[PDB]
Design a protein around this ligand. Structure first.
Ligand SMILES: [Ca+2]
Ligand SMILES: [Ca+2]
Ligand SMILES: [Ca+2]
Ligand SMILES: [Ca+2]
Length: 313
């Protein structure tokens, strides 16, 4: 069952909260600790009510005020909290597509881990907000089978979980076996349909059967955690069919491991999942990585940015 770490604050008063925030901002400087503790303990819907209340009481726009007063990764994190939950994934998608080049990592990550229902809603908001079709901007920025696989997934049309046709489980585990042995370089079209179109429970049975045929897990054969956009996507889909919290816990782990931090991914997964499954991601993190998410964040981040992330966690 999915559990998030941010819920609605009981006893919420949008007006009183807008006043605290005004007082924190107003005058020389800023009180970041006041902003930080309030906005991490109100849900996203309550933050939208605070923005509305701030504007009725003061005629000032709350988010421009926050962008004025805050700086750096803390500012980026607060701005991300303030994005309406329904617009945020579409916002991240638009910013990976836009401009020169493209950030394929955010593309793989959101399209492979969002459910068909989330994707239909995202496609809708993206159009409404940006005028173009998510699909046309994706096609405009990606090439090859990576492009094809993304479009397949963007159709939000996986089969229903019902007819476990074990003959087609058999059949599909064979195709993937043969494809794995050829390093996913030969019959792309066959396996893009299997990974994009089958039901989640069919593909779980297919992944079990693959292992019984080969002796190893299917991600062993696709395991190049770098280099090759299609392979990175195949890996994100296999991982998300098994468990979307486990896959998102893993991208968090790799955002902090080594020199530096991928603060954009750390902010994106912490914020986008705070009210969906961040608790499940936490449990998966500890289980698969033998460290709690809190402790890795704490050693990897500093200042008010750290304080706010630890309160979200
Ligand atoms: Ca000020
Ligand atoms: Ca200050
Ligand atoms: Ca681009
Ligand atoms: Ca690091």
């Amino acid at each position: 069952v999915l559990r998030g770490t941010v819920t609605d604050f009981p006893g919420f008063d949008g007006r009183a909260d807008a006043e605290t925030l005004r007082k924190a901002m107003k005058g020389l400087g800023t009180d970041e600790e006041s902003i930080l503790t309030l906005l991490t303990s109100r849900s996203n819907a309550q933050r939208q009510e605070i923005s509305a209340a701030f504007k009725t009481l003061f005629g000032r726009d709350l988010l421009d005020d926050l962008k004025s007063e805050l700086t750096g990764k803390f500012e980026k994190l607060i701005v991300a909290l303030m994005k309406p939950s329904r617009l945020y994934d579409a916002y991240e998608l638009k910013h990976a597509l836009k401009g020169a080049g493209t950030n394929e990592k955010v593309l793989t990550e959101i399209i492979a881990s969002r459910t068909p229902e989330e994707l239909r809603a995202i496609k809708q908001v993206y159009e409404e907000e940006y005028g173009s079709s998510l699909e046309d901007d994706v096609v405009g920025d990606t090439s090859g089978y990576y492009q094809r696989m993304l479009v397949v997934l963007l159709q939000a049309n996986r089969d229903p979980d019902a007819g476990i046709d074990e003959a087609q489980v058999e059949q599909d585990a064979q195709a993937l076996f043969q494809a794995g042995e050829l390093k996913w370089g030969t019959d792309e079209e066959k396996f893009i349909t299997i990974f994009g179109t089958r039901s989640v429970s069919h593909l779980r049975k297919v992944f079990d059967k693959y292992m019984t045929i080969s002796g190893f897990q299917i991600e062993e054969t696709i395991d190049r955690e770098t280099s090759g956009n299609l392979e990175q996507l195949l890996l994100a889909v296999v991982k998300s069919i098994r468990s979307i919290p486990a896959y998102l816990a893993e991208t968090l782990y790799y955002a902090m491991k080594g020199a530096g931090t991928d603060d954009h991914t750390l902010i994106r997964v912490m914020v986008s999942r705070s009210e969906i499954d961040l608790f499940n991601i936490r449990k998966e993190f500890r289980k698969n990585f033998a460290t709690s998410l809190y402790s890795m964040i704490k050693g990897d981040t500093s200042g008010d940015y750290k304080k706010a992330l630890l309160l979200l966690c």
